[PDB]
Amino acid sequence: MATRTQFENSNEIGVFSKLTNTYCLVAVGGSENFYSAFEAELGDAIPIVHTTIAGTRIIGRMTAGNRRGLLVPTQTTDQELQHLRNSLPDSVKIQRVEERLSALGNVICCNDYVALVHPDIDRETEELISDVLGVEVFRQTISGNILVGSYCSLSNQGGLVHPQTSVQDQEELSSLLQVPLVAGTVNRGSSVVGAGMVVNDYLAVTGLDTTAPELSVIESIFRLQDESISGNLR
Amino acid sequence: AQGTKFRISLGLPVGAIMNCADNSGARNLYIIAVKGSGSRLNRLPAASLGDMVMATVKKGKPELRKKVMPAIVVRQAKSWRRRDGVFLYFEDNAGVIANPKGEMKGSAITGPVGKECADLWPRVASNSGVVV
Amino acid sequence: XXXXXXXXXXXXXXXXXXXXXXXXXXXXXXXXXXXXXXXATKEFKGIKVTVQLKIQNRQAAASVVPSASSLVITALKEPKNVKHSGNIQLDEIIXXXXXXXXXXXXXXXXXXXXXXXXXXXXXXXXXXXXXXXXXXXXXXXXXXXXX
Amino acid sequence: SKVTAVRCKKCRTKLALSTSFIAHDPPSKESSEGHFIKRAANSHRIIDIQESQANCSHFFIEPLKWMQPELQGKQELEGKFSCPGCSSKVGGYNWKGSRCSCGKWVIPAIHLQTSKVDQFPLQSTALP
Amino acid sequence: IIEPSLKALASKYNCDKSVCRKCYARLPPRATNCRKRKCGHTNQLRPKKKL
RNA sequence: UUCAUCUAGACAGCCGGACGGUGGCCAUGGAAGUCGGAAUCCGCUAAGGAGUGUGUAACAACUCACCGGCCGAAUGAACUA
């Protein structure tokens, strides 16, 4: 539902991890306490895969994927590739993508149905995003920012977007995405809301410095929220 | 507050004017000091890719000018060794300004971003378009 | 089963007192414990000290007032420092009252028990002017009658 | 108003509901109980004066059902407890006091610090 | 939670000591002179401050 | 050098008891001899304070004033060079 935890001592989670519907990816250099937040609440439903991308620990920003597919940058070594295809199930498709815009997660924001991409992405790529993910591809920028990945978190239920956005611009995105949209802040007021948190249908993990008024707004638009052991025995 | 980084070659002494990559109004940065530097007689403290340096803005909006504020180096023109083997170098020097926590005032970064700068600072890795 | 006793001090209207600290190791009681106190301190003032001891086993109530202490002399009156220093016509009433106190006094008859009970009341006016020290130094009433 | 629920941060468990809360709301504000007094070894020597904080940083709740395995097993005069799934220091029990940060006293307290737990409404969404 | 039977056991070695004013040494409580030679075996002793 | 205790039992330690009205009473989250202000009483007495202290959340536990035995010849203070 709405859990809060932190990697080594940093609040942001979507930089260091990638949460999807069918799988989840985590960075390698973490405590047991960071992994226990994912292991307890997911359980044996989806595989939690330890990996690295292009010799880094920031695999949330480098990769981009959904239920059906996973895209990795060109700089991904072949040893890191085969470790992914083994642990992830047979259904997901894994493809290396030749980009000038290397970091795919900042460029691409997507879910089961609708993708938003950075507008300077080229035409031969836009076929490969639709072919792998099975998703219609739309070019748009959140009000001031070309980077749709870091400044717009999205899921099947809804979407949390950049705070400095006009209502008429939020209307035009809502028509295109066909989901309701809420502006908010995460991690005591950081505008970086796509990398500040991760989300899917069952779970939404945020930083520890997210205050409770911010976490209440997050759980509302995602509609994740819903007791006998509490009782009065004096 | 600086995380562990493997040593790369020191290529920006005190007095360097590097470009300003983000879109917070500024056009260049005048480096005055480098956080975490050592001490030796007659040695200028130098910057590298990934270091957090103190810098003033010489050219830009007048709100930004005339105040010292720390900054993160995102490109380096001096070549350096990566452990996998290659020697690589960018075309120019570059930096982004930041608050002393390490959060970034800039909304986005133009041009390429050094890979070692991305892992060391998370907020740079959020705003970065291209990482090498 | 088990037999345990604890003691409760003061309180007029309602007070957790000793029991809350002592009720921790025992069965936890908040509503009934002050109610068991409220059964005992009924028709007793709140300003006055009231000494009790309650023996419970599986949430039992025991209401008693032992009154070996100054509770007896405090019982007869009508209510920086609210002074107790009053005059009372103790002599006939206190002789019945000290016999209520002297269940063991561990002395001889009521005469030795009258020289200690009046000394416990170091505040009240007693019989006529003074009922303390040189005035209650000799007692020529009751005496052998209560024996 | 509506009922409120207290969920644990990083455990996501409803620790205590409403129909609780012995909140004790007004402070004393006079010199001996609104002020924190730090005495010395002898002769009631006052060395430090600390003014009380604004809001009481705790939640004073009744003894509940999920504290019963901790309260009965190794009963003592003071201690602490946790969320039942993450084992972090969430609140402590004290039969003494520990007034509030803002200060009165209470009765025996089950003090539940407002840091590292938060308060939610149990009712439907606000729909902003 | 300290169970003050044990605190009185603990206070003998830590708290119930005397302190020399000059050399700040931790001396036995009923001692008259300091055992250290650098302060000249002085008799100017104070109690250790209680918490 | 000058004083004072001492086989009429010293100093040191040991060995007994330290009880009854006692959680007295105002004092306030709680103070029971010990955070304290004013009061200072009786009983059992060989003798024992509404209490010299350590300590206790509040008690306790210990210790002391005091009461009687044993151990048995030296002990204490202020100085001067």
Swiss-Prot record, chain A:
It comes from the Eukaryota. CDD domains: IF6. The keyword Nucleus applies. One of its GO terms (cellular component) is preribosome, large subunit precursor. One of its GO terms (molecular function) is ribosomal large subunit binding. The modification Phosphoserine is found at residues 174-175, 228. Gene3D superfamilies: L-arginine/glycine Amidinotransferase, Chain A. Phosphorylation at Ser-174 and Ser-175 promotes nuclear export. GO terms for biological process: assembly of large subunit precursor of preribosome; cytosolic ribosome assembly; maturation of 5.8S rRNA; maturation of 5.8S rRNA from tricistronic rRNA transcript (SSU-rRNA, 5.8S rRNA, LSU-rRNA); maturation of LSU-rRNA; maturation of LSU-rRNA from tricistronic rRNA transcript (SSU-rRNA, 5.8S rRNA, LSU-rRNA); ribosomal large subunit biogenesis; ribosomal subunit export from nucleus. Keywords: Cytoplasm, Initiation factor, Nucleus, Phosphoprotein, Protein biosynthesis, Ribosome biogenesis. The keyword Transferase does not apply. HAMAP family: eIF_6 (MF_00032). Monomer. Associates with the 60S ribosomal subunit. Binds to the 60S ribosomal subunit and prevents its association with the 40S ribosomal subunit to form the 80S initiation complex in the cytoplasm. Is also involved in ribosome biogenesis. Associates with pre-60S subunits in the nucleus and is involved in its nuclear export. Cytoplasmic release of TIF6 from 60S subunits and nuclear relocalization is promoted by the GTPase RIA1/EFL1 and by SDO1. Also required for pre-rRNA processing. Belongs to the eIF-6 family.
From Swiss-Prot, chain B:
GO terms for biological process: cytoplasmic translation. It is found in: Cytoplasm. Transmembrane segments: none annotated. GO terms for molecular function: large ribosomal subunit rRNA binding; structural constituent of ribosome. There are 2 genes for uL14 in yeast. It holds the Pfam family Ribosomal_L14. The gene is RPL23A. It comes from Saccharomyces cerevisiae (strain ATCC 204508 / S288c). Belongs to the universal ribosomal protein uL14 family. SMART domains: Ribosomal_L14. InterPro entries: Ribosomal_uL14, Ribosomal_uL14_CS, Ribosomal_uL14_sf. The keyword 4Fe-4S does not apply. It comes from the Eukaryota. Methylated by RKM1 at 2 different sites, but it is unclear which are the 2 methylated residues among Lys-35, Lys-101 and/or Lys-105. Component of the ribosome, a large ribonucleoprotein complex responsible for the synthesis of proteins in the cell. The small ribosomal subunit (SSU) binds messenger RNAs (mRNAs) and translates the encoded message by selecting cognate aminoacyl-transfer RNA (tRNA) molecules. The large subunit (LSU) contains the ribosomal catalytic site termed the peptidyl transferase center (PTC), which catalyzes the formation of peptide bonds, thereby polymerizing the amino acids delivered by tRNAs into a polypeptide chain. This is Large ribosomal subunit protein uL14A. Keywords: Acetylation, Cytoplasm, Methylation, Ribonucleoprotein, Ribosomal protein. The modification N6,N6-dimethyllysine is found at residues 101, 105. One of its GO terms (cellular component) is cytosolic large ribosomal subunit.
UniProtKB/Swiss-Prot annotation, chain D:
Belongs to the protein-tyrosine phosphatase family. Non-receptor class dual specificity subfamily. This is Tyrosine-protein phosphatase YVH1. Present with 7570 molecules/cell in log phase SD medium. Coiled coil: none annotated. May be directly involved in signal transduction and/or cell cycle regulation. It is necessary for maintaining growth rate or spore germination. Could show both activity toward tyrosine-protein phosphate as well as with serine-protein phosphate. Induction: By nitrogen starvation.
UniProtKB/Swiss-Prot annotation, chain E:
It is found in: Cytoplasm. It comes from the Eukaryota. There is a cross-link at residue 17 (Glycyl lysine isopeptide (Lys-Gly) (interchain with G-Cter in ubiquitin)). Coiled coil: none annotated. Component of the ribosome, a large ribonucleoprotein complex responsible for the synthesis of proteins in the cell. The small ribosomal subunit (SSU) binds messenger RNAs (mRNAs) and translates the encoded message by selecting cognate aminoacyl-transfer RNA (tRNA) molecules. The large subunit (LSU) contains the ribosomal catalytic site termed the peptidyl transferase center (PTC), which catalyzes the formation of peptide bonds, thereby polymerizing the amino acids delivered by tRNAs into a polypeptide chain. Component of the large ribosomal subunit (LSU). Mature yeast ribosomes consist of a small (40S) and a large (60S) subunit. The 40S small subunit contains 1 molecule of ribosomal RNA (18S rRNA) and 33 different proteins (encoded by 57 genes). The large 60S subunit contains 3 rRNA molecules (25S, 5.8S and 5S rRNA) and 46 different proteins (encoded by 81 genes). This is Large ribosomal subunit protein eL40A. The gene is RPL40A. The chain holds residues 77 to 127 of 128 of the full protein.
